[PDB]
Symmetry: C4
Subunit: 206 residues, 4 copies
Amino acid sequence: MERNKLARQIIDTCLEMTRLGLNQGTAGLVSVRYQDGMLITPTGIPYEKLTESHIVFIDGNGKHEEGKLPASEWRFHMAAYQSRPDANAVVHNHAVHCTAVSILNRSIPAIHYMIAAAGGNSIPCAPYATFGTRELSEHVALALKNRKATLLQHHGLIACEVNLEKALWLAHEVEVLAQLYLTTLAITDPVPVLSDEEIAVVLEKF
Amino acid sequence: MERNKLARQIIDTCLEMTRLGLNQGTAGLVSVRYQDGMLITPTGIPYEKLTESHIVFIDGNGKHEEGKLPASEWRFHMAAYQSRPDANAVVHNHAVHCTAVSILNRSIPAIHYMIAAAGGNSIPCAPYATFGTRELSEHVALALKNRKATLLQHHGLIACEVNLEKALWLAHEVEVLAQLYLTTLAITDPVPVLSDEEIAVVLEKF
Amino acid sequence: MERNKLARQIIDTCLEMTRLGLNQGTAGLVSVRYQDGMLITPTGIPYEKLTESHIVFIDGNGKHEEGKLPASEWRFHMAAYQSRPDANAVVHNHAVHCTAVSILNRSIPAIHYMIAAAGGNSIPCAPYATFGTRELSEHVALALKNRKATLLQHHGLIACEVNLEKALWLAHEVEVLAQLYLTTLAITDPVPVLSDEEIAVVLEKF
Amino acid sequence: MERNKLARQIIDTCLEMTRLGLNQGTAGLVSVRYQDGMLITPTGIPYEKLTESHIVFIDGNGKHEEGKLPASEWRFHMAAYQSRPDANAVVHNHAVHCTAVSILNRSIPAIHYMIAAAGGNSIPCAPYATFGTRELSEHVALALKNRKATLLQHHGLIACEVNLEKALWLAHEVEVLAQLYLTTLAITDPVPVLSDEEIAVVLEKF
Ligand SMILES: [Zn+2]
Ligand SMILES: [Zn+2]
Ligand SMILES: [Zn+2]
Ligand SMILES: [Zn+2]
């Protein structure tokens, strides 16, 4: 649990997140909780050129390491960590199906029992706000109060969990749910969903 | 036909089922018939970390190996084996197109002559029921009485055959049929299908 | 131009045709013209298990090599070779977008200038007929009289050219055209196409 | 910055452009600015057979290297270089989603903040014109006056930037935007877009 181990995993998560086709416009950003702030992917360096010595450390004040620029979308990583104390890893990306549902400005409702992996009966879509600003972070923070993933209108996805492995898995899982909403949405509207009672049983079960 | 050979193939089938993109939410489960019960993939271990010593053995009583937890979706593997005596391998997954057709609650009708690979003129969709419960298994069992694959509403697919190779092939084939239903369903409804007489000739031919 | 070189290329074309995702239900069949008949992929053996000693030779009488079963869909390979004397390689497959357009029973019209790669202003769809029968071959033969690729209703695609390389390329190219018809067909109908005059200029140009 | 280094990168860009699935009908063409003209991929040789000694040099007069045929779609590479003095690399391709939007003859509007990567609030679609002719080049030149990528009706995409890396990245990014337009276009029309004011803030920000 040395800095460098965490820096390798973030790099492995970038490489695996690209494997699954979740990191397409090279929009992916990965962060882990560390010390009193986080370890995050920097700006500029496309994943395959990424070395442990590239990962930037940002403190709880928001001050960063001298000589390294943090990702350009870093402050909502900090908002997610502050709003959800249990999160230890954050995943961001412009995966195409999530973003497609985020352009229609819709929540993804309980069309499948795995919807409960993010804490409830949906995956909400937070309102649009210029990237990198504080107003964007307020939206993310409000949205993650009772869910672990959220779409961000006209933009993409933020997923958070106990570690990188689950966070990656949750982001991947939201994409599949996304895709399923869009494919069935083209045929019928609304889409058949599981009732709130059914979703409370599944939640208990997990 | 030692335990360990069967444990490698299940592992190869997991790895190949991921190759084809049939195992996406890491929802895949593979089982083979063995002795008086089956050999199945356990819960927790994502496929690439899977070793022969991970495969769990569940007997016909439903009792499992001490110290190993069976997949969380194991009892409908047992229902499929009991309902279809000829099955020797079972494949389960949340492949995206199958699941998309399962959210609309529809059967996939004879839109293509390969529909006959699953025993008849369609691929039925069994009604929804909380995962892992006995009511879910009753649906699966009723659904596999005269077909070898079935969708499961709001959930995914169960495919069964004489061995792993064909079972994998059948599941893969149902996904392609699925995808074809959805792509043409967006354009026209209903979709043109082959008549029952045409499908009886193809069945005879196989 | 020994038998064995031709048997390797057919095998390479199977392996590459799978690379591009054109051979999905393991429906692919490849044939080359040889001597007074052809060299074709046999029945049973999935591509990766395929060895040079698997390729079957069928003569112009339709008699095959003792001890080897030809593909189950071999006689329309023979019809394509007889109808189009210039063809030296034939490619068949159930690629998903081609087959999707073949289930709607539609021709793919000149929506893109590459449509001219198959000889004219469209890719026709031959009427349905039980696989492997002579009535199916009559359709294929009529359809390839003035085109090099044809969809086959409720089934897939046959593409033919001067060698394996181009045949593979033509089949691949028809899939992309297919996909483009389906994606734009979901939005508008009819789809904008290039005029017959524009298509005669492009034909001259190739 | 020797000829040969530039010839390797063009070849690497072809190989990577195929990795991402941007070069499907083997329609891809890559060019870099060099001396008083450019270095471009030749006609005939499919990418994997491509060697440094294949790259053709075309001068500002349009005269080419003796014994090597330039790509068949080379003159709009020259139009892009002349119209956009800052471009040092050009990417062309028939990527399927771009081409799908180009068959409907539509611009891709600001449905996502990354639309600003190409200089403004859209990605325009230049009118159709027989490939390889001068009238086609006039369209491209007019279209790139104030944008860095343009669709070309009934055909595909041209993207241009400071180097190969960014050009490749921009083309890739237009495909994702394309795909997003098409997926949401099937559900609703028109599609929600970001206002011109929002897009002026994002532009300033980049
Ligand atoms: Zn972002
Ligand atoms: Zn399941
Ligand atoms: Zn066939
Ligand atoms: Zn072109």
